[PDB]
Amino acid sequence: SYSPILGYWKIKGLVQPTRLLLEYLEEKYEEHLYERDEGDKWRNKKFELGLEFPNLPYYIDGDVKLTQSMAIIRYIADKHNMLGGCPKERAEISMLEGAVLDIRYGVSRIAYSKDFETLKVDFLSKLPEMLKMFEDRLCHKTYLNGDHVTHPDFMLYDALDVVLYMDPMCLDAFPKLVCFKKRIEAIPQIDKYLKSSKYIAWPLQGWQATFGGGDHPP
Amino acid sequence: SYSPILGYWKIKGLVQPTRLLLEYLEEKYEEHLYERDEGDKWRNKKFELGLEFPNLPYYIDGDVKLTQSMAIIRYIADKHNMLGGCPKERAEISMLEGAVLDIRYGVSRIAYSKDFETLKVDFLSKLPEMLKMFEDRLCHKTYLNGDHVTHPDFMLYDALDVVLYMDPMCLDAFPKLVCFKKRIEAIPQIDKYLKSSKYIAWPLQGWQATFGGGDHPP
Numbered sequence: 145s146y147s148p149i150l151g152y153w154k155i156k157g158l159v160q161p162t163r164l165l166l167e168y169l170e171e172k173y174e175e176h177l178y179e180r181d182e183g184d185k186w187r188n189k190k191f192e193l194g195l196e197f198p199n200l201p202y203y204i205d206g207d208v209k210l211t212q213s214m215a216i217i218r219y220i221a222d223k224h225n226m227l228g229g230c231p232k233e234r235a236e237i238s239m240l241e242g243a244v245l246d247i248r249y250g251v252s253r254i255a256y257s258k259d260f261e262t263l264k265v266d267f268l269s270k271l272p273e274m275l276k277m278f279e280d281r282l283c284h285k286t287y288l289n290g291d292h293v294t295h296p297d298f299m300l301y302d303a304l305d306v307v308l309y310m311d312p313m314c315l316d317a318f319p320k321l322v323c324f325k326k327r328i329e330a331i332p333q334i335d336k337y338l339k340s341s342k343y344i345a346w347p348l349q350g351w352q353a354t355f356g357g358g359d360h361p362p
Numbered sequence: 363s364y365s366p367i368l369g370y371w372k373i374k375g376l377v378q379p380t381r382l383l384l385e386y387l388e389e390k391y392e393e394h395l396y397e398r399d400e401g402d403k404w405r406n407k408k409f410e411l412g413l414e415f416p417n418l419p420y421y422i423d424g425d426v427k428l429t430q431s432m433a434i435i436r437y438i439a440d441k442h443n444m445l446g447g448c449p450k451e452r453a454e455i456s457m458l459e460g461a462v463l464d465i466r467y468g469v470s471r472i473a474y475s476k477d478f479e480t481l482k483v484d485f486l487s488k489l490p491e492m493l494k495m496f497e498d499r500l501c502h503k504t505y506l507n508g509d510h511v512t513h514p515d516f517m518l519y520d521a522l523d524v525v526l527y528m529d530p531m532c533l534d535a536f537p538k539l540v541c542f543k544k545r546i547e548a549i550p551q552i553d554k555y556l557k558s559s560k561y562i563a564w565p566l567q568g569w570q571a572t573f574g575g576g577d578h579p580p
C-alpha cells in the first residue's frame with residue numbers, strides 16, 4: 145500500500161547498508177530524516193510512535209513498527225526471501241553479518257572518543273586481519289555468499305567506504321576488496337542511487353563525532 | 363551424532379547467553395575452553411579449524427563450522443524453531459536481540475578502557491533509559507516475547523548479571539527486571555546449570571579487562 149517509512153539522522157551511520165539494500169531491491173520507501181539541530185524535535189516525538197524500543201533508526205510499514213538497525217535490514221531481507229533458505233545458510237549469512245560489524249562497530253566504538261587518534265592506531269593495526277578474511281572469502285566469489293547478492297554485501301560495502309576515510313590506503317593490500325567495492329558501485333540501481341539526491345555522503349557518524357563527524361569531510 | 367563443540371575463552375563474555383540457551387534446551391554439547399595462558403595455544407590452532415572467519419567463539423557440529431556469537435546463538439535457536447514463525451515475529455525477536463546488545467556491548471565497549479571509571483559514569487547515566495524499555499516490555503509478560511522463552515531472554519539475563527557487577531543498585535528502580543532475573547534462575551534446567559561445575563562465574567570480560575576482568579571478583 146503506502147510507502148514504508150525509514151526514520152534516522154541525516155547521516156550514513158547505522159542505516160546506510162539498509163538504504164543500499166532497499167535501492168538494490170528497487171523498493172519504494174520514504175525517509176523521515178532528522179537534521180543536526182533536530183535533537184529536541186526527535187526527543188519530543190520518540191515515545192509517540194508506538195515503538196516498543198524507541199530509537200533511531202525506525203522502520204514503519206503497516207505490518208511492523210521496528211527499531212534496531214539489524215532487525216530492520218534483516219526484516220527487509222526476510223521480506224524478499226534473502227535471509228537464507230535453511231538453518232545452515234541463515235547461519236552463514238549471520239556469520240558474514242557479524243564479521244562485517246566487527247569492522248563497522250570497530251569504527252563506531254572509537255569515533256566519539258576524545259582519544260580517537262590514539263585508539264585509531266590500534267584499530268588500524270588490527271584491521272588487516274579482519275579485511276584478510278573477506279579478501280579470502282572473495283577468492284573466485286562474485287559476492288560474499290557466492291553468485292547472488294545478500295544484505296551483508298551492502299554492510300561490507302558501507303564498512304569499506306567508512307574505513308577508507310580513516311586511512312585511504314587501508315585497502316591497498318586487498319585488491320579483491322577494492323574490486324568488490326567497485327563491483328557494488330557497478331550495480332546499476334546502486335550507481336543510480338549514489339548519484340541521486342537521496343544519497344547522503346556525509347557525515348559517517350553523528351555530526352559531533354571526532355571521526356566521521358562535522359558538516360563536511362575534512 | 364557426536365556432541366557439538368562450543369569453543370571459547372573460559373569466561374562469560376560473548377558466549378554466556380548461548381550456554382544458557384543450550385542448557386535451557388537440555389542439549390548435549392561439549393566445550394573447548396581456552397584458559398588465560400592459552401593465547402598462543404589458540405593462535406596456533408585458529409587458522410587450522412576450517413573456519414571461514416576464525417574467531418572465538420566457534421561452534422562445530424558436523425553441519426556447520428560457525429564463528430560470530432550472534433550467528434551461533436541464532437543457529438541453535440533456529441535448529442529448535444525459536445527464531446520466529448514469520449517475518450514479523452523474526453523481526454520482533456531480532457529487535458529484542460539488538461536492544462539487549464545495546465546494554466551488553468555498552469559494557470564491553472568500555473571495559474578494556476584505561477578511562478573506564480570515567481566512561482562508566484556515562485554508561486550508568488544512560489542505562490536506566492535502556493532498562494526502562496525492558497521493564498515496560500515485561501508488563502504482564504512472563505518472558506520478553508510473551509508466554510514462551512526465546513534466546514533474547516538469556517541475552518537479557520546475561521546483561522543484567524553483568525551490569526549488577528558494575529553497580530549492584532542499578533536494578534533497584536526496576537522491580538519487574540529483578541523478578542525476571544529471578545524467574546530465569548527459577549527455570550530448573552538453569553538452576554541446575556548455575557549450580558554445576560560447567561558454570562563459569564568469572565571473569566565477565568577477558569581476564570585483562572579493567573572491568574569484569576581478573577581471576578576473581580573484586
Ligand SMILES: N[C@@H](CCC(=O)N[C@@H](CS)C(=O)NCC(=O)O)C(=O)O
Pocket residue numbers: 153157158190198199200201211212213214460461464
Ligand atoms: N543498537 C541500536 C543503536 C541505535 C543508536 O545508537 N542510535 C543513535 C544514533 S547512531 C541515536 O541517536 N538514537 C536516538 C535515541 O537514542 O533516541 C541500533 O543498531 O539501531
Ligand SMILES: N[C@@H](CCC(=O)N[C@@H](CS)C(=O)NCC(=O)O)C(=O)O
Pocket residue numbers: 242243246371375376408416417418419429430431432
Ligand atoms: N563479533 C565477534 C567478536 C569476537 C571477539 O571479539 N572474540 C574475542 C573474545 S571476546 C577473541 O578473543 N577472539 C579471538 C581471536 O581474535 O582470535 C563475535 O561476536 O563473536
